[PDB]
């Protein structure tokens, strides 16, 4: 179906401990495929998925050069942000960026992104029009003015509508074995008595790809949103993900509860019950 490519930059200052560290990771959907760390012994863009190893040396050189220039760029960005926020050079600060494109089943651009953060807060973001900016505050408005004058949005848009979708289409083809395979969750419900009159029903989803999933408990067909313990979807470390949802239920009422599972890998949503 639809697919995404995203690059994630983290630039972290560390006064007294060297120049700011710059890290990039690239994903297609929920699959990491490339990394860069300025603290590496000989920093370069490195493959993290088999299907990207196909790319010739020129790709790796070009990609490495971008990241190496970014290390210097984001060091300047950090220095600039200190001035814009009247901050001292004693503190550690973080700039983040996430950019990329979403394509439809036909590979056409659905939408592009380019968002920046400072110390975990929105700073500036390219609007969906790929022509204009939303600045979060008066400091980011200064960047906005510079970027407007420098036609940054036009360069972003050229990338988002061109290379971003073109390279993502190629990655999807090269990695079709995996990037175009959904793995459905393996599911079950466990039962643990809490006390004589309360029991925990826990609905498990394991081994699924991609990470998007919905797990919900209903009591008598009514969603138990407020009473469900839902953990964050978590990486198993073999590309797949795990999640569970739990409710505490009155003893003897277990059968009034149903677990509902939606996942792209499932032909239809699943209903599970405690199977004593």
């Amino acid at each position: 179906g639809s697919h995404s490519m995203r690059y994630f930059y983290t630039a972290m200052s560390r006064p007294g401990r060297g120049e700011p560290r710059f890290i990039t990771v690239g994903y297609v959907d929920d699959t990491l495929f490339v990394r860069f760390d300025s603290d590496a012994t000989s920093p370069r863009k490195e493959p993290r998925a088999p299907w990207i190893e196909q790319e010739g040396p020129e790709y790796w050189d070009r990609e490495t050069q971008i990241s190496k220039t970014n290390t210097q760029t984001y060091r300047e960005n950090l220095r600039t942000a200190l001035r814009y926020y009247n901050q001292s050079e004693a503190g550690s600060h973080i700039i983040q960026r996430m950019y990329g494109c979403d394509v439809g089943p036909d590979g056409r651009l659905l939408r592009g992104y380019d968002q920046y953060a400072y110390d975990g807060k929105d700073y500036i973001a390219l609007n969906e029009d790929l022509s204009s900016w939303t600045a979060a505050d008066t400091a980011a408005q200064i960047t906005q003015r510079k970027w407007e004058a420098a036609r940054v949005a036009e360069q972003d848009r050229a990338y988002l509508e061109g290379l971003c979708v073109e390279s993502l289409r190629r990655y999807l083809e090269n990695g079709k074995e995996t990037l175009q395979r959904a793995d459905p969750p393996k599911t079950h419900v466990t039962h643990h008595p809490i006390s004589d009159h309360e029991v925990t029903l826990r609905c498990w989803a394991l081994g699924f790809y991609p990470a998007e999933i919905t797990l919900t408990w209903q009591r008598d067909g009514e969603d138990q949103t407020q009473d469900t313990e839902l953990v964050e979807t978590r990486p198993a470390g073999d590309r797949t993900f795990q999640k569970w949802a739990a409710v505490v239920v009155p003893s003897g009422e277990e059968q009034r509860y149903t677990c509902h599972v939606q996942h792209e890998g499932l032909p239809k949503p699943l209903t599970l019950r405690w199977e004593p």
Binding site: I66, S67, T73, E76, Q155, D156
Partner: peptide, 9 residues
């Protein structure tokens, strides 16, 4: 693939 956005803040 990335592209180089070289304009600073």
């Amino acid at each position: 693939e990335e592209y180089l956005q070289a304009f600073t803040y």
